Design a protein around this nucleic acid. Structure first.
Ligand SMILES: OC[C@H]1O[C@@H](n2cnc3c(NCCc4ccccc4)ncnc32)[C@H](O)[C@@H]1O
Ligand SMILES: [K+]
Ligand SMILES: [K+]
Length: 545
DNA sequence: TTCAAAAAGTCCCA
DNA sequence: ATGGGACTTTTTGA
């Protein structure tokens, strides 16, 4: 329940907020961490503040009460007026209280530490500086009773499949003083995700974003499966609204290459570019000028989107795959009439242009009429998981029978020629499915609308969609999930724009040559690459890049 | 009635 | 033991 931020990142975040504080003008800054834990950030804040006061102690002594401003009084002053923390964990607060006390009895020094829920606490005043690492909890792992509170009181940033850390962004922004500075490390996903749309709008319209450090898929928290970014923002009145963006170039680097994070940011391991906050739409397209030019050329030249021409759908969700998915060689399939059996593939079965042969079968149990006619299937296959099946939401409410698929969709959508792609991948992998393949939600499908069949063929679409141009084009705005993994979900895949011009026939012909080679017995994988290079050239010519 | 989003992923191995 | 690679379920709000 407690996560330790790497020291190099803590120091960078504390420096980002305090390095230019004018302690002579304001010797009473309020610095807050609302998920302080054991004080990873606040103990560093103490050290930075102590040097700031000690370095200017005689100037403060002359300007203000000369009896109050002594070196011996710095410790008490910092704890009384400067450092604030909050955390839900009582033990963590107790440890941090001891650590702050031991930085140096008399009249006991009051320490501004609150054991509370920071999202419910009535905050009695605003703060100059806010730093830290909020909790990340998604829609599956968040308690449903608590979600009702968030859906009611944090509706500006929290809806649907949003995350708990969205609300910490809102709370931090709301209690930041005018002219104050906030700097936090959170997951990166809100920068592109559909769930983060309202959160992005709230940030854009209430603070100036000074800086975004985007580590992409790099592993910042050891043994933790999350991807991180650092956001620095302020509430200063300024006419300029440009964001510094530092995007890592190599996801494999060790974060401790130099003594400081800023050395790494200035190095060749990162790229830097600027983004005008006023030009942010509901989506934040954070790319350099070359990629922006590349992206805008494709957007302006393409007159159609996939959503215009195609029908998208998520795959089957059985609710318990072990109950319904069997190996095609499993002897228990002899109990199942073939009318109930469907071919079943996983995301790893999707290559560019074609799907591997299926190794698994789905029992489409929705077509089982009653429990008496097919008792052996129920007793010997599906019923082996009956307890877990009955715990599915729609079974408890009586919507589904215990042996039915939870979301069986429409068979007719799958039993047709269609394009399939994995939901998470390192590259564009769009394949024509010829074999009426079914799949779980790790594979998405679409088919072309009837009225667009004379303009776009399946063979033409997989040709451009698998090209190097469209791989780079999709990843410009794609949701980066982990190292070498992007989400390929319809909320972004169906926004891909496509074109139709004089190169259509040759692109389509090259695609059919590739498909014909890939479907042979002795695949000339080499020839396919050459044909792909030729198609990439045609596509680059068509789009004027 | 029934869609589609969601990595403090999950699991294994050298 | 850890860090890195292959691979991806079903719960959930709307
Ligand atoms: O690294 C994460 C750190 O953040 C702390 N923390 C977690 N949730 C907190 C919170 N409100 C949400 C309560 C909450 C959380 C989950 C479910 C229901 C309610 N208010 C303050 N601090 C919090 C953890 O102690 C840890 O030290
Ligand atoms: K004085
Ligand atoms: K990561």
């Amino acid at each position: 329940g407690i996560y330790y931020t790497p020291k190099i990142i803590v120091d960078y975040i504390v420096k980002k907020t305090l390095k230019n504080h004018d302690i002579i003008k304001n010797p009473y800054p309020r610095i807050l961490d609302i998920s302080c834990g054991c004080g990873n950030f606040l103990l560093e804040v103490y050290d930075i503040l102590y040097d700031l006061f000690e370095e200017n102690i005689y100037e403060l002594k002359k300007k203000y009460d000369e009896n109050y401003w002594t070196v011996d009084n710095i410790h008490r002053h910092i704890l009384n007026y400067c450092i604030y923390g909050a955390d839900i964990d009582e033990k963590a607060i107790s440890i941090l209280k001891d650590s702050l006390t031991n930085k140096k009895d008399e009249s006991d020094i009051k320490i501004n530490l609150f054991c509370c829920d920071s999202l419910k606490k009535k905050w009695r005043y605003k703060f100059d500086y806010i730093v830290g690492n909020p909790p990340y909890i998604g829609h599956k792992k968040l308690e449903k009773k608590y979600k009702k509170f968030l859906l009611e009181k944090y509706s500006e940033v929290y809806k649907d499949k949003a995350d708990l850390y969205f609300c910490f962004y809102k709370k931090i922004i709301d209690i930041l003083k005018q002219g104050g500075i906030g700097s936090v490390i959170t997951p990166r996903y809100f920068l592109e995700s559909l769930s983060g749309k309202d959160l992005r709008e709230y940030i854009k319209s209430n603070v100036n974003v000074q800086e975004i450090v985007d580590f992409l898929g790099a592993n910042i928290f050891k043994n933790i499966g999350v991807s991180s970014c650092i956001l620095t923002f302020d509430k200063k009145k300024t006419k300029e609204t440009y964001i510094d963006v530092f995007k890592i170039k190599n996801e494999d680097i060790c974060i401790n290459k130099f003594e400081t994070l800023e050395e790494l940011l200035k190095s060749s391991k990162f790229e830097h570019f600027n983004i005008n906050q006023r030009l942010l739409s509901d989506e934040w397209i954070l790319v350099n000028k070359d990629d922006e030019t590349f992206y805008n050329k494709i957007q302006e030249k393409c007159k159609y989107s996939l959503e215009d021409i195609a029908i998208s759908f998520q795959g089957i969700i059985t609710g318990c795959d072990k109950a319904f998915i069997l190996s095609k060689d499993d002897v228990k399939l002899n109990l199942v009439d073939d009318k109930f059996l469907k071919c079943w593939i996983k995301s790893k079965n999707i290559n560019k242009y074609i799907v591997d042969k299926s190794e698994y079968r789905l029992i489409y149990s929705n077509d089982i009429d009653n429990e008496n006619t097919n008792k052996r299937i129920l007793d010997e296959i599906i019923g082996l998981y009956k307890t877990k099946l009955e715990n599915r939401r729609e079974c408890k409410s009586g919507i589904r029978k215990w042996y039915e698929l939870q979301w069986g969709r429409e068979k007719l959508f799958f039993e047709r020629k269609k394009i399939m792609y994995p939901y998470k991948s390192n590259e564009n992998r769009f394949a024509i499915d010829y074999d009426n393949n079914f799949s779980s939600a790790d594979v998405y499908s679409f088919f072309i609308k009837e009225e667009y069949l004379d303009k776009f063929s399946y063979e033409y679409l997989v040709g451009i969609l698998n090209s190097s141009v469209y791989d780079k084009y999709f990843k410009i705005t794609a949701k980066k999930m982990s190292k070498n993994i992007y989400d390929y979900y319809p909320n972004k895949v169906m926004k891909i724009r496509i074109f139709r011009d004089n190169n259509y026939e040759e692109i389509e012909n090259l695609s059919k040559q590739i498909i014909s080679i890939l479907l042979n017995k002795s695949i000339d994988k080499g020839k396919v690459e050459k044909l792909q290079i030729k198609m990439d050239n045609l596509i680059m010519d068509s789009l004027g890049i």
